[PDB]
Design an enzyme around this catalytic site. Structure first.
Site: not given
Length: 710
Positions: A241-242
């Site tokens: 995830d970012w």
């Protein structure tokens, strides 16, 4: 000649890269991108015939930027229902066909891999992202999600379960730690991903934020490498995830290929890691190669460049049927639904009857053109909406928005006498919507505020003192308090978040053309104090934030309720249809190998046509280990049976699905002794059709997911 992908031997291609070019790949990037908006992108080393692929945000729909500048035609996205509506159908063939229409948008609009769909277990109904997760049962969630991937990956566009593991809570998820013994993870929270990996074969796998027993999920080897790549046989790419993860070195060594979206500091730590000599080239080469296997199949490498010819008209029709079949009728009293032809004037209650909800907020939110609000859904079905009550609700919202999510418009401004002066029947719309970032509040997200209760009873008693009936439309994103106020209203429909085609799906359910054959993917308790995992979940009104413990074992949402017979408002799989079905004989042939194959023929004798969700629950004594009362081991949603119609359906249960993991031997096992099988309407059924069986190396694994020791 420069070696390039698809011609030179794959090994000889990785050679031609330097440490500059390698780190550029494993760390992707992000006006400035090939497709307007649509979240992240992946870099390409062009000299080796490698393009710069694209990834966008789902899972409730492809998310791209509307028209801005230097463009001829606007671009929008069909707002499909949420992943709970998909789960609420139990029709994996239906979900398959939505991913078809969903993947068509992904391909035509210029995307390669969509971030869809998260299939994490529903653990506590106070979770912010419960709408993007599928069910509390892993078998329902893991199977319905697998068909969702199939429909999107039959268009040759990638799919990523949005959160790999243990993202069941949204408080301090960036530094949250989950603590539990191996069996709780494998049988429950790893199961839905185990199915999708084996069968759907999704291209990319997005790891979660939180930790496991002390080590990050994105930076854990045994999880990403031993369980994912070596047990389930995963071939694609593992991303994060970012801005997720601490050490960029541990991510690479754990088997996590790509880092998303990419910052300047990550490269510097990876750059220093190989030059000082910590991260080995074999590790980086392994991560790069998984990205090369990933890019090869993307249509960017085959150059099916974005034509931007979606045909959005045709895809929208599919969503209306997915939401309609995915709506569940929670209570029908005196057969008040479907509304008869005599009802023509209708009084509409609830602020969210005019600002109707389509899907959750934040990343899952999608770019839609029109929202079919309930105010308009009753206008295509021919009904007349009340002029006064429509005037009161439309004009109320500006004043409330002006001064300090929105308190319900009280009945003081609305004319109570005029509602029984012209209108024949009244509808209520309870609107809840929890954002991803902020967890649900006890006061309003679960329990109803007193602005809602005094509308429920106030509308009920005033109308019931006119002989009329009142229907509540639960436009909610999850479980809410029900037991207190449920008795008053005569009918309660649960629409979940039906997307753009909202009011049309409610209209068809009310008119009676379609039959709501939806069942619950989760168990609604009486009040919040019934929830077992409540002790292991924070209170959004330091334990259960920085660290979290799982003491409930295998039993989660409904497994605990059945072994201990806890009162619940609506059990798992509960659902009703206008017609009533009758079952065939419970006789399953015992396969020579040892597996179980169940057949049954439902019998329907109803005026209108409907569909039957046959569900198979198998029980366990638990002489070896503590066991859940009844875990679903198969289901079956029939066709659209006509009046006086009946079709046989097939339900198979492999011998591996009759196994359960064991901590001591670090292996799965099937417990011997007398066992029980069932075929029921809902999970909490007193009387299901039983066929008893005598159950006699299913899977041996290494001790992954233990608890740290110094």
């Amino acid at each position: 000649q420069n070696p390039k992908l698809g011609v030179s031997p794959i090994q000889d291609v990785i050679n031609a890269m330097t440490l500059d070019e390698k780190i550029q790949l494993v760390v992707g990037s992000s006006q400035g991108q090939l497709v307007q908006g649509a979240a992240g992108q992946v870099n390409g080393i062009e000299r080796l015939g490698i393009p710069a692929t694209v990834v966008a945000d789902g899972p409730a729909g492809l998310r791209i930027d509307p028209k801005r500048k230097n463009t001829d035609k606007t671009f929008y996205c069909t707002h499909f229902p949420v992943a709970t509506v998909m789960s609420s159908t139990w029709n994996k063939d239906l979900v398959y066909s939505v991913g078809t229409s969903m993947g068509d948008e992904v391909k035509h609009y210029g995307v390669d891999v969509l971030l869809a769909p998260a299939t994490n277990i529903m653990r506590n109904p106070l979770c912010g992202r419960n709408f993007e997760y599928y069910s509390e049962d892993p078998l329902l969630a893991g199977t319905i999600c697998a068909a969702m991937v199939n429909g999107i990956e039959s268009n040759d566009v990638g799919t990523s379960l949005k959160h790999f593991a243990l993202n069941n809570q949204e408080t301090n998820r960036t530094r949250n730690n989950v603590i539990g013994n191996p069996r709780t993870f494998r049988e429950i929270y790893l199961k839905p991903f185990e199915i999708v990996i084996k069968e759907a074969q999704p291209w990319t796998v997005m790891t979660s934020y939180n930790l496991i027993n002390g080590t990050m999920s994105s930076e854990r080897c045994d999880l990403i490498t031993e369980i994912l790549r070596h047990e389930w046989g995963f071939k694609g790419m593992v991303m994060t995830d970012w801005f997720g993860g601490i050490s960029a070195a541990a991510q690479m060594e754990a088997g996590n290929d790509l880092l998303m979206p990419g910052k300047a500091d990550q490269v510097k730590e990876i750059r220093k890691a190989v030059l000082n000599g910590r991260l080995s080239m074999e590790i980086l080469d392994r991560n790069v190669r998984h990205i090369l296997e990933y890019i090869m199949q993307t249509p960017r490498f085959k150059q099916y460049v974005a034509d931007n010819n979606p045909d959005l008209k045709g895809h929208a029709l599919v969503a209306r049927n997915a939401a309609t079949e995915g709506m569940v009728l929670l209570k029908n009293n005196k057969n008040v639904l479907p509304l008869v032809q005599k009802i023509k004037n209708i009084a509409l209650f609830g602020n969210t009857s005019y600002d109707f909800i389509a899907g959750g907020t934040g990343s899952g939110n999608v770019n839609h053109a029109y929202v079919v609000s309930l105010l308009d859904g009753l206008k295509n079905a021919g009904y007349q909406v009340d002029g006064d009550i429509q005037k009161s609700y439309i004009e109320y919202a500006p004043k409330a928005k002006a001064n300090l999510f929105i308190p319900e418009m009280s009945l003081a401004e609305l004319n109570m006498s005029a509602a029984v002066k012209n209108n024949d029947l009244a509808i209520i719309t309870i609107g809840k919507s929890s954002g991803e970032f902020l967890d649900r509040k006890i006061s309003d997200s679960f329990n109803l505020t007193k602005e809602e209760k005094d509308m429920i009873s106030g509308v009920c008693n005033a109308f019931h003192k006119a002989g009329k009936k009142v229907v509540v439309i639960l436009n909610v994103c999850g479980v809410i308090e029900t037991k207190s106020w449920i008795g008053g209203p005569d009918a309660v429909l649960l629409s979940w978040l039906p997307g753009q085609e909202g009011g049309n799906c409610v209209a068809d359910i009310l008119t009676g053309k379609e039959n709501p054959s939806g069942r619950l993917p989760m168990t609604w308790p009486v009040s919040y104090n019934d929830v077992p995992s409540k002790a292991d979940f924070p209170n959004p009104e330091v334990k259960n934030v920085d660290y979290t413990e799982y003491n409930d074992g295998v039993y989660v949402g409904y497994r605990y309720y059945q072994t201990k017979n806890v009162p619940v408002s609506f059990p798992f799989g509960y659902g009703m249809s206008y017609t009533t079905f009758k079952y065939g004989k419970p006789v399953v042939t015992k396969d020579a190998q040892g597996n179980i194959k169940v057949l049954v023929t439902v019998k329907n004798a109803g005026k209108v046509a409907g569909k039957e969700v046959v569900q198979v629950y198998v029980a366990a004594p638990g002489k070896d280990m503590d066991k859940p009362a009844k875990e679903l081991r198969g289901f079956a949603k029939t066709k659209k049976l006509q009046p006086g119609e009946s079709e046989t359906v097939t339900i198979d249960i492999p011998y591996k699905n009759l196994a359960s993991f064991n901590e001591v031997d670090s292996q799965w096992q099937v417990e011997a002794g007398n066992y029980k099988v069932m075929v029921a309407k809902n999970a909490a059924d007193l009387k299901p059709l039983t066929t008893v069986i005598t159950e006699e190396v299913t899977e041996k694994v290494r001790p992954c997911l233990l608890k740290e020791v110094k």
